[PDB]
Amino acid sequence: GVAQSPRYKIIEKRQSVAFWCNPISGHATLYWYQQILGQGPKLLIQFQNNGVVDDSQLPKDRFSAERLKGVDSTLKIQPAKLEDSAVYLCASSLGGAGGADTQYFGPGTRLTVLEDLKNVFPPEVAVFEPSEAEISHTQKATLVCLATGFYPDHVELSWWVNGKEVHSGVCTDPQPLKEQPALNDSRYALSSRLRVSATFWQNPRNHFRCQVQFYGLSENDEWTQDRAKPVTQIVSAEAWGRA
Amino acid sequence: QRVTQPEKLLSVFKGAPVELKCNYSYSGSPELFWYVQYSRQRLQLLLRHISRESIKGFTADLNKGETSFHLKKPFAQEEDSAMYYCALSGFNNAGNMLTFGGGTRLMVKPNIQNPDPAVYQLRDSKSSDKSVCLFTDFDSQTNVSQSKDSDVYITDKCVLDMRSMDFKSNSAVAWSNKSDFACANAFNNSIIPEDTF
C-alpha cells in the first residue's frame, strides 16, 4: 500500500515539519489531505506526475509540497501553527484518462503542535487483578489496565497473554479522558479490559501484560529538564494467574 | 461542489437498520462514493454509485430528485462499526479530485443475552492500595454518565467479545485518588435496581 512517515510527530509552534509519502508503484496521481479531528479529509495539493495540478487550497504562506521525480512526495509546514494539529493523509490513484479512479490511502501522519514541549509526558501503566466476587458470581475474570498521566494523546494499548498479543475478550476506550478537564494542557487517562474464564485466570502459569506504546519526542528534540526525556517508548504492567 | 453528512454519530442496535445520510450540491451529473475506515486500518473505498452490488451488506442509491446518496443496510452487524465518509468527484478541478463529507461514526450495540449487572472492586497487582471499580454485564439499555466530581474518573461503556465463549458484555471503569471513594457510590448514575454489589 501507500506508505507514510512518520506515523506520529510532535512539534512546537513556529517549528518546521516534513511528511513523506510513497504512492502505489506506477500511480500517476498523488494527493495530500488534511483531516481535522471530527471532520473529513480536505485536499491540500494534488500532483499529476511531477506537476502540481491543484494547489488552490494549499495554505501557501506556510505549506508547500514537492514530488520532484513523479513518485514519492514531501509535504512541509514552515512555520507550524497550533491549528495545524491534524492527520495528514497521502493517497494515490492510477491517473488514467477516464473518470474518477479509486483513491488508495496511506496510513496517515498524526501531527500534534504544542505550545511547550515540556508538557509532554509518557504514561504510567497499572494492571488490576480480577475480583474474587466476579470469579464466584460469573465464572469469568476481568482484568483492568489503566494508562494515566500521558500527554499528548499518542497511545496504542494492547494486551499480551503468555507473550502473545490477544484481541478476543478485550475492550479499550475509544477516547481518553482528561485528568483535569478545566485545563487545555491536561494529561490523559485511558482504560482497557481483558476478560478470561475463571479457570484461565486461576492457572498460576498464565502471564498477563498490558502494553502501552507512547509516541513522544524524537531523538533530535532538545531536552534540558530534570526528568527523563519523554521519548517514544513502551510502558507495561503485568499480572500472574493466582489460585 | 459540496457534500454534507448531517450527523456525526449514529448508534444502532445489532440487527436494526442503518441509514447514513449524504446529500450533495453539484451542477451536472455527479459521481458519488462511500469510503470506510475501520479501527487501526487505512481509509478505503466501500462502494460507488455506478454498481448495484451490495458490498458488505451495504447499498447506496443515487436519488437525484433528493440529491441524496444514503448508505443503507437492513440489519446492523457488530463488524460494521467504523467511520464512513461520503464523497463526490469534480471533473477538471485542475485535475479530477474528490470532495469528502464530514464523516459519520457508526456504532452497533450488542444485544446482551442475559443482563447480570454488577459492580466489582479490583485491586492493583503492584503493592499499592489503589483499586478500581468495574461496572459490568449491564443491558445496552444502560447509559453511563461521566463523573461530575473532578477527582473521580469514569470511562464510557465498552463492549468486549469472548468469542471462544460466544459471549459479549458491556463494562465501564471508575477510579479515584480520594479516601472517600467507594464502589457502592462510584456510579451514582441511572443503574439497574437489580445491580449486584
Residue numbers in the entry:
A (entry chain E): 1 to 243
B (entry chain D): 1 to 197
Please give the exact wording used by the authors of the publication that reports this structure:
To assess ligand-induced conformational changes in the TCRs, we determined the structures of RLQ3 and YLQ7 in the unbound form to 1.88 and 2.35 Å resolution, respectively. Superposition of the VαVβ domains of free RLQ3 onto those in complex with RLQ–HLA-A2 revealed structural differences in CDR1α, CDR2α, CDR3α, and CDR3β. The CDR3β loop underwent a large movement (r.m.s.d. in α-carbon positions of 3.0 Å for residues 94–101), thereby enabling CDR3β to insert into a notch between the C-terminus of RLQ and the N-terminus of the HLA-A2 α2 helix. CDR3β Gly98 showed the largest individual displacement (8.2 Å in its α-carbon position). CDR1α and CDR2α displayed small yet relevant movements (r.m.s.d. in α-carbon positions of 2.7 and 2.0 Å for residues 26–30 and 50–54, respectively) that allow them to engage the HLA-A2 α2 helix and RLQ peptide via four hydrogen bonds and 22 van der Waals contacts.
Here we report crystal structures of one public and one private TCR (YLQ7 and RLQ3, respectively) from COVID-19 CPs in complex with HLA-A*02:01 and two S protein epitopes, corresponding to residues 269–277 (YLQPRTFLL; designated YLQ) and 1000–1008 (RLQSLQTYV; designated RLQ), that were found to elicit almost universal CD8+ T cell responses in HLA-A2*02:01+ CPs but not in healthy donors. For its part, the RLQ epitope, unlike YLQ, is conserved across human and zoonotic sarbecoviruses and is therefore a potential candidate for inclusion in a pan-sarbecovirus vaccine.
